[PDB]
Amino acid sequence: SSKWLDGFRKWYYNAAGFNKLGLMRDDTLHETEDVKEAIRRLPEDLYNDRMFRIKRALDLTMRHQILPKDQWTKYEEDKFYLEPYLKEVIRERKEREEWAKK
C-alpha cells in the first residue's frame, strides 16, 4: 500500500544523510543549466536560505560532523521549493527544442 511505501521512503530519507546536514532535496540537486536557471529565478529569501544551508552543510562536512538530531530536517518538513521553477524551466526548454526540431 501507500503506507509501506511512505515508511520505506522515510527509511531511505534517513539513510541518504542530507537531512543530518540540514539540507533539502532541492539543495542537494546538482546544478545543471536548468537548475541554475531555477536558482536565478528563485526569490530573494529562498535564495538566501538555500545558500546559508549549503554553507552550513559545507562547514559541517569540513568539521566531519553533523547537526544534532533535534536540528535534523524532517521528511514531512522537506519543502519542494525548486520544483515549480524547475518544471517551468524544463517546459520552456522542451518548447525551444520542439521549435528547433520543427
Binding site: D45, N48, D49, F52, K55, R56, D59, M62, R63
Partner: protein, 240 residues
C-alpha cells in the same frame, strides 16, 4: 609432481625489522662458499673489495684475494698472462661460459649466487630447506642417475649433489661444522651477497622511524594550528 613445498619461516638473527646480520656467520658462510660452493657456482657481482669492511680486515681480504690466481692482460707483446688477484677483482669463474658449466655438470646449469636469495621464493629459508632437505625418494618416484630427490626443489628432481654434510670443512673459529650450522652460515652469506645494503638500510629505517615519529605529531600539530581558525568557526544567519 606439480606441487611445491613451501619452506618454513626460520627465526634468523636478521628477521626483525631492526635486526642486522651476524657478521661472524657471514664470515663462516663465505668460508663455506669458498671451500665448497665455489667449484660449481659463480658470484660475479661480489668482490673481495665488497668483502672488506663487513667481514674481514683489509690485510685478510688482500691475503685471501692473492691466494687465488686470476687471468689478466694484455702485456706488451699481446699475450694473456696470469697474476695473483687483487681487491678490485671479483670472484673467479669456475667455468668460462655457461655451456662449459652445463657440460661439466650433467646438463644442469648452476646459477650465479649473487641474487639467489632475492631471486628465489623464500630466500634464505629456501636455501636452508634445499640444503638440509635432501632425502630418499618415496615409492613410485623413479629418478635417473645424475638427479637427486629434493622436496623443496621445484620439480623435485634437482641436478645438485648434496654439497654439505658433517665435517665438510674446518672453521677458523672452532665452531662445530655440522650440516645445519654450515647451511645457516652459508644462507646468511648468500643473504648478504643478495643485499649488501642490509644493515645500512636497517639503520636508515630506524633513523626514519625515530625522525618521523618526531615529525608527524608536530606537523599534524602545525596543520591543526593553522586549521583551528576554521574548525572552531561559528556561523550565524540573521535575515531581516
Amino acid at each position: 609432481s606439480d606441487l611445491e613445498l613451501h619452506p618454513p619461516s626460520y627465526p634468523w638473527s636478521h628477521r626483525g625489522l631492526l635486526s642486522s646480520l651476524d657478521h661472524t656467520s657471514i664470515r663462516r658462510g663465505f668460508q663455506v662458499y669458498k671451500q665448497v660452493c665455489s667449484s660449481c657456482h659463480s658470484m660475479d657481482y661480489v668482490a673481495y673489495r665488497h668483502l672488506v669492511g663487513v667481514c674481514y680486515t683489509e690485510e685478510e681480504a688482500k691475503a685471501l684475494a692473492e691466494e687465488v690466481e686470476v687471468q689478466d692482460g694484455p702485456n706488451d707483446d699481446g699475450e694473456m698472462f696470469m697474476r695473483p688477484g687483487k681487491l678490485s677483482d671479483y670472484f673467479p669463474k669456475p667455468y668460462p661460459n655457461p655451456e662449459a658449466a652445463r657440460a661439466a655438470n650433467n646438463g644442469a646449469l648452476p646459477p650465479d649466487l649473487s641474487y639467489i636469495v632475492r631471486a628465489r621464493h623464500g630466500g634464505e629459508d629456501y636455501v636452508f630447506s634445499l640444503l638440509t632437505g635432501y632425502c630418499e625418494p618415496p615409492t613410485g618416484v623413479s629418478l635417473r642417475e645424475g638427479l637427486y630427490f629434493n622436496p623443496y626443489f621445484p620439480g623435485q628432481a634437482i641436478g645438485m649433489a648434496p654439497p654439505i654434510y658433517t665435517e665438510v670443512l674446518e672453521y677458523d673459529d672452532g665452531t662445530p661444522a655440522t650440516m645445519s650450522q654450515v647451511a645457516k652460515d652459508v644462507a646468511t652469506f648468500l643473504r648478504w651477497a643478495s643485499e649488501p645494503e642490509h644493515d645500512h638500510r636497517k639503520r636508515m629505517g630506524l633513523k626514519m622511524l625515530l625522525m618521523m615519529g618526531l615529525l608527524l605529531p608536530l606537523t599534524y600539530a602545525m596543520k591543526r594550528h593553522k586549521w583551528s581558525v576554521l574548525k572552531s568557526r561559528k556561523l550565524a544567519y540573521r535575515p531581516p
